[PDB]
Each structure stands twice: as structure tokens, then as C-alpha cells.
């Protein structure tokens, strides 16, 4: 699986469970084209983002929804939502992991890039 | 100064000086305009920041080029940026700080918002 | 595995790998009692520390051999090692992952704790 | 001011006011000497903490009481307490600035080392 998003809840200690997620490709024409979306799991993971569809070289937005997240359990969140912007398989095919951490006014982000 | 953004190095242990952030208001049209911009100072800080009398309530973006900061260090960073999107004085008047902690695979980014 | 260690590398994109970890649990006058120690593998990763029903209810602290990590890759860090002490298992027992983001002058910790 | 610490809280996004940190130095004889000790104030900062006629190279540690602050809060937060342990001042005088961000299952501290 080369595109994994994994969230956790920092005010509960957990996966965050349920988390809309949404991936988009930058295309030739400099527009974000849709590539996949997403519901993390009870393990706060969302898997096989790339079933039937190409990997390949480019830019990619993974787009959090952390606002939907926390307004669902009572909270008033900063964020509407959590971006992370990067580069894909550049120097050849890779898998990537990234990580959320979540807070109401805070968040922080990892990419685990890993080699196949 | 109702919107200041702080930026530190979570590698050497320091300010991030001279980090280029660019601040958008969401117009109407539903499109991020162009609202201000500027670059870290030598203790991180960007302040004097919001164009004349325009802080209003509103949606706001602000992205920091953290890639262009690894860049000029002579590191690879994963992210094309980082960016940071919230409602600002939607209940009245707050002032905003906007904390970034950067790596070159991860950040971490902090909304500390306090009463006029 | 009811405790375990995830130590992640935010510089490189990576597990941190062969990192030294050693548990304790603060014994009965008050003293921090040697429990379980390891090294996380090639996925950063650190398991079969507690053995389930070895794992009683108790103080207990993970330490994490930062320190060594990056004078092995040729940095000079900043902290001499990363400490996480919490009170384990005072309800009914329940699995922690105890995850670590590494950086020279930073680090970050999180508890994942799930009902079995 | 030769060690400042500095708290935020990521839940609320504001400083953690009234926090209680306590510094040790490490003795002759490898056990943990009161140091310095204080509340942080309306900032989250801790100022007046050393004299740097007095803040001699040496191993300290830097502890915070982040499980009362999050009680008075009637938050049961994860950890006893956030913990960072450093050598300070084996080059020469500096500056060190320990900040540290808090949520109920997740932490993260950096060192900020500027120089004179």
C-alpha cells in the first residue's frame, strides 16, 4: 500500500476514528484533480488509497478533515483542516505513511517514506 | 500586531530566519486573495503583517515555504510547503500567533489565540 | 503486545532504527526498578517488552537512548535522552504504544491506549 | 535570562499559565539537585529562573507538572510529568529556551540554544 494515512487523537490518547479524508493530484494544468478519498478506520488508518488507480510521479494534497472531526465531538476546533503538500516518486516508486497528530488548535504532521 | 507567525528549527535548535510566509483572505468568488506576506526575522518572527485596515473576519491561509528554507541549507524536506488554514474574528476581535516547528520530514503547527 | 515502543526519525523520513530503549516501574520505596530494555528494529519498532501478564499496575518510565542515535548518524543532539513516566494500567488493563518523534533539538511523544 | 521555559496549550491554544516547573542539576555523585523552581505566568514563560553568575556547565533537568495543570482543568491527562534532561553551558554561555507544547496524551518539547 504506497499512500497510507494514519491520524491520532492527541486530546484522547486514540486513533482518530472516522476522519474524512481526501487526496487530490496536481494535474498538467496546475489544478487539484481528485485521487482518492477516504474515512480513516478504528485504527485511524486509511489504506489501499491507490486500488485501480496509477501512482505515479507527481504533486499530491492530502487533505484532513479536522474540523468535521472535532465538531463532531463537542469541540470548536482553530483549523478547518490539516494539508500536507508534497512531491511523490520523484526518485522512483516509494511508499508513503503520513502521520496526524490532532488538537483542537494544534497539529502536527510526519511522512514516512520508506523504500520497496 | 493581531496576526504574528513564529517559525522555529526543530533540527539546529533555532529560529527559522528569513522563511517566506504569504497570507490569503478567502474572497467571496470563494478564491484565496492575495492579503499580505513578508519573511521571518532573525528571532523567527513576522510581525506588522496585516494590510492597513484589512484583519477582518474572514478565512485565512497562511503558507510558509519551509521547502525554499530546507533548500537554502542544502537539506531535501518533504513538504512543498506548509499550510494554515482558519476563520479569524468571526466572534469578535482576537489577536493570532501562529507557531510553526519544523523538520525536514515533519512539522508541527499551533494556533495560541489571546484576547484584545 | 500491551506495551509498546515507536521511535520515528522526522530529519530522515524514517524508523529510527537501533535505538537503545530501557523500561523501569517505580518500585515500593519509591525507586525505579530495571523491567524490560531493547533496541527498536528495523521498522523502529520495539516489542515483547512487558509480557502480558507480566505487566502490572504501576509507575512506569520509557527511556530512550536519544542521545546515542545521533552521534551514531554524526549529529550532536540537543537533550541526553527522551523520558515518558505515566501511571499504567490503574483501571482496567489496557495496551499503550508509546510513540517518539526524534529530531537533534526536539522531540515529541504520544500515548495510544486502547481497550482490549 | 540564561533559561527560559516556555509551556502552550494545544487544546485551547493559549499559553499554560501557572504551570508548575522544578529544575535539578545533577550532583558530584549522579543524583538529582534542586536548582531552580517556579509557576509560568500569564505568557506561559518562566522568566527568572538562573543567574548566569551562577548556571555553571552541568547536566540539567528541566521537569514539568503538566498532570496538575491538566486536573485543575478535570482533564486526567497521560503523563506524571514531561521531562527534559540536557547538558547546558559545556561550550560556554548560551541562552537555552526549553519550550514545551502539552495535550492530554501527547507532548512535545525544543531547544532553543542562541548565543550571547
Same mark, same amino acid.
Given at each position: ?11 484522547? !490518547?486514540?486513533? /482518530?476514528?472516522?476522519?474524512? @479524508?481526501?487526496?487530490?493530484? $496536481?494535474?498538467?494544468? =496546475? +489544478? ?15 489504506? !489501499?488509497?491507490? /486500488?485501480?488507480?496509477?501512482? @505515479?510521479?507527481?504533486?499530491? $494534497?492530502?487533505?484532513? =478533515? +479536522? ?50
Amino acid at each position: 500500500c504506497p499512500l497510507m494515512v494514519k491520524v491520532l487523537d492527541a486530546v484522547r !490518547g486514540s486513533p /482518530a476514528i472516522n476522519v474524512a @479524508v481526501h487526496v487530490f493530484r $496536481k494535474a498538467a494544468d =496546475d +489544478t487539484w484533480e481528485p485521487f482518492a478519498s477516504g474515512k480513516t478506520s478504528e485504527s485511524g488508518e486509511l489504506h !489501499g488509497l491507490t /486500488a485501480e488507480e496509477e501512482f @505515479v510521479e507527481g504533486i499530491y $494534497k492530502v487533505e484532513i =478533515d +479536522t474540523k468535521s472531526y472535532w465538531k463532531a465531538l463537542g469541540i470548536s476546533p482553530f483549523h478547518e483542516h490539516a494539508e500536507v503538500v508534497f512531491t511523490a516518486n520523484d526518485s522512483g516508486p516509494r511508499r508513503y505513511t503520513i502521520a496526524a497528530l490532532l488538537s483542537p488548535y494544534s497539529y502536527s504532521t510526519t511522512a514516512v517514506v520508506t523504500n520497496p
